[PDB]
Design an enzyme around this catalytic site. Structure first.
Site, PDB file in Angstrom:
ATOM      1  N   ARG C  54       0.894  -1.239   0.046  1.00  0.00           N
ATOM      2  CA  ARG C  54       0.045  -0.141   0.062  1.00  0.00           C
ATOM      3  C   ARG C  54       1.060   1.440   0.030  1.00  0.00           C
ATOM      4  O   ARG C  54       0.949   1.991  -0.926  1.00  0.00           O
ATOM      5  CB  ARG C  54      -0.949  -0.059   1.337  1.00  0.00           C
ATOM      6  CG  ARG C  54      -2.245   0.922   1.250  1.00  0.00           C
ATOM      7  CD  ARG C  54      -2.947   0.715   2.627  1.00  0.00           C
ATOM      8  NE  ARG C  54      -3.505  -0.676   2.730  1.00  0.00           N
ATOM      9  CZ  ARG C  54      -3.136  -1.551   3.578  1.00  0.00           C
ATOM     10  NH1 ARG C  54      -2.145  -1.355   4.415  1.00  0.00           N
ATOM     11  NH2 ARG C  54      -3.613  -2.666   3.743  1.00  0.00           N
ATOM     12  N   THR C  55       1.910   1.479   1.195  1.00  0.00           N
ATOM     13  CA  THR C  55       2.593   2.670   1.264  1.00  0.00           C
ATOM     14  C   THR C  55       3.351   2.996  -0.045  1.00  0.00           C
ATOM     15  O   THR C  55       3.532   4.096  -0.602  1.00  0.00           O
ATOM     16  CB  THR C  55       3.382   2.452   2.328  1.00  0.00           C
ATOM     17  OG1 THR C  55       2.226   2.847   3.430  1.00  0.00           O
ATOM     18  CG2 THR C  55       4.722   3.409   2.402  1.00  0.00           C
ATOM     19  N   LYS C  84      24.783  -8.418   3.697  1.00  0.00           N
ATOM     20  CA  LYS C  84      26.296  -8.395   4.390  1.00  0.00           C
ATOM     21  C   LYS C  84      26.726  -7.527   3.642  1.00  0.00           C
ATOM     22  O   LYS C  84      26.858  -7.187   2.589  1.00  0.00           O
ATOM     23  CB  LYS C  84      26.950  -9.922   4.263  1.00  0.00           C
ATOM     24  CG  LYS C  84      28.147  -9.933   5.373  1.00  0.00           C
ATOM     25  CD  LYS C  84      28.969 -11.477   5.170  1.00  0.00           C
ATOM     26  CE  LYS C  84      30.093 -11.131   6.090  1.00  0.00           C
ATOM     27  NZ  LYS C  84      30.889 -12.265   5.937  1.00  0.00           N
ATOM     28  N   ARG C 105      11.432   2.993   3.668  1.00  0.00           N
ATOM     29  CA  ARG C 105      10.984   2.120   4.898  1.00  0.00           C
ATOM     30  C   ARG C 105      12.070   1.150   5.099  1.00  0.00           C
ATOM     31  O   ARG C 105      12.572   0.551   4.319  1.00  0.00           O
ATOM     32  CB  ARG C 105       9.693   1.351   4.310  1.00  0.00           C
ATOM     33  CG  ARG C 105       8.969   0.651   5.587  1.00  0.00           C
ATOM     34  CD  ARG C 105       7.619   0.260   5.199  1.00  0.00           C
ATOM     35  NE  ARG C 105       6.636   1.079   5.916  1.00  0.00           N
ATOM     36  CZ  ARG C 105       5.388   0.602   6.553  1.00  0.00           C
ATOM     37  NH1 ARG C 105       4.917  -0.702   6.441  1.00  0.00           N
ATOM     38  NH2 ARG C 105       4.491   1.454   7.223  1.00  0.00           N
ATOM     39  N   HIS C 134       6.460   7.466  11.489  1.00  0.00           N
ATOM     40  CA  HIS C 134       5.670   7.320  10.037  1.00  0.00           C
ATOM     41  C   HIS C 134       5.221   8.631   9.955  1.00  0.00           C
ATOM     42  O   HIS C 134       3.831   8.876   9.597  1.00  0.00           O
ATOM     43  CB  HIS C 134       4.616   6.102  10.247  1.00  0.00           C
ATOM     44  CG  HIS C 134       4.272   5.443   8.944  1.00  0.00           C
ATOM     45  ND1 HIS C 134       4.933   5.752   7.817  1.00  0.00           N
ATOM     46  CD2 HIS C 134       3.264   4.584   8.843  1.00  0.00           C
ATOM     47  CE1 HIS C 134       4.045   4.868   6.900  1.00  0.00           C
ATOM     48  NE2 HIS C 134       3.182   4.394   7.372  1.00  0.00           N
TER      49      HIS C 134
END
Ligand SMILES: [Zn+2]
Ligand SMILES: [Zn+2]
Lengths: 146, 310, 310, 146, 310, 310
Positions: C54-55, C84, C105, C134
């Site tokens: 969604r975001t 790594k 994110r 957020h």
């Protein structure tokens, strides 16, 4: 300057910057007894030296011998009543415990409640140190990059 | 028509010095004054059968920075179908039918050259093919060396790390040995030295080279320190950790370095360059990752545009 | 220069009420008359190290709706290398070299603030960082509250559900307590109440708050019902299922609700709002998901554009 | 107490066993100057203190405040010509840097080339330290652990 | 008490010439006249933290033929161990509260030796601890050589294959370097050559060795041809295939072999010994796996029995 | 018939004071003078549908020391069970057609109790059924307390750690609430406090308890210090660390402990008991795991033997 107390050990002639390693490594601070340390002491006889005095404390033989790997030319001096009653110099010990770190990432010493222990072998141009656990032998130059 | 117009960019061996130079020229031009709508209306496919987030984002930023559309994927997984049945050949034969150019990273040596034979007229560009080629990396590397040194001829380049398996060090040596007067220093762990054929091409052209054991032997002669990542896992953990007092770079070692020496790295750099190296002026690997844009933009502008007006 | 021009949007605590208001104003303007080529030629990176479809699609629609190009990825897996060696620092130091802004994110609290220190001049925007912040969610939430209530001051806001772990309810409270006259009702299962520091900030400014046990105690006073999802798995299944006669919303309970009360939810809403609630006028969470566009567009227009002409 | 150095800093009335913890932690030992250190001294109050004399360096207003969470009652006497030309007492800072470790195990600080930093607030009783990065606030007893 | 009573068999280094003879002489008697109730009422932990079905089944068949019960696990995949804090030292401190001997395979070098600090008085036999030791495999190999040549002294032993990473070839060189007048031929590609500290150890005790390019060179004077697996992945695919004809045995090669010559190989055999070699009198790799039983039983009888009077 | 003959041990609730005494008194005799052939010719299903290597190895070592054979599995990962229709009721109806006792661990609350409706006359012992019961762990704990304090009555028992989800602390409170004059100290952070229905049950039968903040408060009068694991993930990382000094035992804390005091902990121990506590006379968590054998054998002897006349 720093040179005698009533009783104790004077660790003299440590090269510059090793004095704090020794304090840390051998946990010489964890005693509530008079320690005097002098870092970057002049001493034309060295250029720069470090001196630690642990008052009313005597380094049993082997403790002295562990210093072989770091400040190898240092004189441990017994003062057991007002003056230099015993001089000592570091010899390489046959085993160095607790203080080193195994280079082998996949050595098991790394994740577990286990003191490092390394076998000492001055061979040819250096000293080889073999791990207790992973049995792999490394140059002390590798082991001490740390 | 530019020399590279609608040409398949697959191997560095395939590009002549003249073509290397045209690529590097264009790139120096676009950097400066970029035409952002040059590839307007093109649809380029970014087909990463092997995933590489940095590359895929450098190439895709490039496509965008020139006004291009992008369709494509990423595996290191199964995408759909292409796991069974879909032969790369069938997959390109269908993708030539859609797009104008195919950028592609694939885990098998020679996958971009096969693709050519099925791309019809669509040009394909090699974003890495197994342990064989990565031209786009060597181009952005030349551009950074040229941009810092002012030239590609008569340089003292030290190549350090996994010289045996580093895709890149193999290619950079082929590209730089297409220029005159270069001298190479090869500093590598015994078990990972420069393969014999690199060294044999080097002796036919009679280019000056020597092996070394630690950076500090050539610190003060080196113009470029190209560093690769010694991969921990292709080695025994007690052997990886035991090599000398390591061949990892610390700023201290830069103390006797020329004022113009730059330190380069494809990246990832995990441990083979330490953080203080990052602050010194000799640090040039992030700057390098940015020149990937203009190099790859150069590439896309020439392959897809008949003549470059800039 | 607008106040937020080339500013890093990382935490709500960091934005003053004046800045909240500029964001909400711009957004109300773009909604109405959108300039779709404002960010033409920008390449924005959508770097989801933690994936949120969604975001990532709200932010990316925004970039597009303003005329922007996008390069980027999604983990909840390994992308390539960065698992790594690639430190977020090395990864941003290379991505600043490519793009104009970094939306990101990441699953660790503080990942956007570290990124700042390596983004050079490229602005980075926090799309969620662990259990910390957020901002973008709180902005679209304010916009919906403002757009339904006509104001952000002197409101009666009931916050329901996982008040202890809901990232969002923590932030919405910080943002709304930067306005005057607000009163908060906190309805939460015992084991998941409002952490002491939210409540202590609330008592220094002396903002009116009270805990409650079920929505039906404040049904008729509430202007905004903000609902979070009580996560089934951080609880014993016999304990999740035993709380009262639940704190889940059914249309029936809306029977005594004000004509202007709106019910909000970040989403997913699995069970904590029932389907008949969807049909009632008080239903405002999909409308809310759509205001994410203008809020995030606002954000991108100010951070990347010196002055907004609209 | 003991006798003086050629112009520099004297940090006295450091709690016993905090002395070394400051030498290591603030890295005061990487100097070329004579640092003389007395550990577990009487000749100063509250029994046994620690004492550090850094020669020629003079610790900034800032560094002086950084001792405050460990040493808060220490005296940072400033010496020129074997006499205290000035006297500083540790006042509490507002930002303690890279000496502490965020207890938050999911704080990004941990794995990266960032120095730790914390907002300090309130005084003596409970000193809340707020991580720069995860913005989570902790009590100083928790931060000052491991 | 017999010498090995209750000792932990961790390394070949720890076993003396006499200890090797005492284990091999016992295996000879058990092969002869078995003892199916000798370990009755003993319970043995077969703890294979790294899975190795081949070694596990031999060790457990040996535990069963002496009458003991077996409990244990084979992780690598997962059972529930070595995860979420729970350290190896604590696992051994619980397990040696139930069992009489611990047999364990672990991925990390040194693990068996650490177990030993925690078992207290329960014996720990090492079935494989990373790239370090494996005494039980060297003991079945020594028993196969003794069984077929009649001696462990004055032998001509060729080690063919990966000698750099070959955990087996290293240990058998050390074991065999305790007996007299053994002479070694090492036939390995250079990338995989026998490490210098084994070679140093050889020279120092006046034992003879020599490198040879091909198996052809030394077939006539060889007594034991010990082959090892080259793991393809220790080289590039390209590198692997290219050794001008290879290190693979075919029965043609054995045409000039001594009547007593035996081909030994630790298994899995994949490609280095051709099928046709199996129906040759010299092929002895499966009969070697068979004596794994005997060498393994000997050890468990001697470690758990104060006196074995057979 | 002894009381427990052929009964299904499903919950501590089902065992009476007298049944607890009869199992603990038997474990005492088997610890003393063992019976290695008592269950010879019996086959026991060790069915661990949820893996738990620690509990499995104790139960199977106990099955082996009484002479029985063991068949079974450890799913969690996968074997082939509880999948594609095949219900638990049908599995038990097949398995009890071969075995003499079923030992099972299952992820769902109530599973052992359902097995019981399907085994017919084969006994089902519960090795763990979700967050519900675990009688066998409470029985080894009760046996450790009886063994070390000499009694199960008139005790001072502190429960330290996660008491809300602690399946172990709940059952031992119920077991111990059957004997007299026991007094409880609960030391838990509030998020993890001892649930009200255990507390209600305590009050009702006139047993005394008290909450305390720190272990310091009650060290002097404690007899049994039972520690539990806080699972870090039952809190935020932030929340976890912040208890102003914590609920972790170090040997300093024990300086004022009663000569007889024992520290018990169900394991895995990760962080709540410091290493230094192991070399203290009071540390008793491994010796407790050891008595797991005895309590477990007692049960299997009594359930499978009409009369145990020892
Ligand atoms: Zn090691
Ligand atoms: Zn933090």
């Amino acid at each position: 300057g720093v040179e005698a107390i009533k009783r104790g050990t004077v660790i003299d002639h440590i090269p510059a910057q090793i004095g704090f390693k020794l304090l840390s490594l051998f946990k010489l601070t964890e005693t509530d007894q008079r320690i005097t340390i002098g870092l970057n002491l002049p001493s034309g006889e060295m250029g720069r030296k470090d001196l630690i005095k642990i008052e009313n404390t005597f380094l049993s033989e082997d403790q002295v011998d562990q210093l072989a790997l770091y400040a190898p030319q240092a004189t441990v001096n017994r003062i057991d009543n007002y003056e230099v009653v015993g001089k000592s110099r570091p010899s390489l010990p046959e085993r160095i415990d607790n203080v080193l770190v195994c280079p082998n990432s996949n050595c098991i010493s790394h994740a577990e409640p286990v003191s490092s222990s390394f076998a000492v072998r001055k061979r040819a141009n250096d000293i080889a140190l073999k791990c207790k656990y992973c049995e792999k032998e490394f140059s002390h130059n590798v082991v001490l990059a740390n | 028509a530019n020399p590279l117009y609608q040409k398949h960019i697959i191997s560095i061996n395939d590009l002549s010095r003249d073509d290397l130079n045209l690529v590097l020229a264009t790139a120096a031009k676009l950097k400066a004054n970029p035409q952002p709508e040059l590839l307007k209306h093109k649809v380029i496919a970014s087909c990463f059968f092997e995933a590489s987030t940095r590359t895929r984002l450098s190439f895709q930023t490039s496509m965008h920075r020139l006004g291009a559309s992008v369709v494509g994927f990423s595996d290191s997984a199964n995408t759909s179908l292409g796991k069974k049945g879909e032969t790369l050949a069938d997959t390109i034969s269908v993708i030539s039918t859609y797009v104008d150019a195919i950028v592609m990273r694939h885990p098998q040596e020679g996958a971009a050259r096969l693709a050519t034979e099925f791309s019809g007229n669509v040009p394909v560009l090699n974003a890495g093919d197994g342990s064989n080629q990565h031209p786009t990396q060597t181009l952005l590397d030349l551009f950074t060396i040229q941009q810092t040194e002012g030239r590609l001829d008569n340089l003292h380049v030290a190549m350090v790390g996994d010289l045996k398996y580093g895709r890149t060090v193999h290619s950079l040596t082929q590209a730089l040995a297409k220029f005159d007067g270069n001298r190479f220093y090869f500093i590598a762990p015994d078990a990972l030295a420069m393969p014999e054929y690199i060294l044999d091409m080097l002796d036919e052209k009679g280019i000056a080279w020597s092996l070394h054991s630690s950076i500090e032997e050539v610190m003060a002669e080196v113009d470029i320190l190209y560093m690769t990542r010694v991969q921990k896992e292709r080695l025994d953990p007690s052997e990886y950790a035991n090599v000398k007092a390591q061949f990892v770079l610390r700023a201290s070692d830069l103390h006797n370095a020329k004022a113009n020496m730059k330190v380069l790295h494809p990246l990832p750099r995990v441990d083979e360059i330490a953080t203080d190296v990052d602050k010194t002026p000799h640090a040039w690997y992030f700057q390098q990752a940015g020149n990937g844009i203009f190099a790859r933009q150069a590439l896309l502008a020439l392959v897809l545009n008949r003549d470059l007006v800039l």
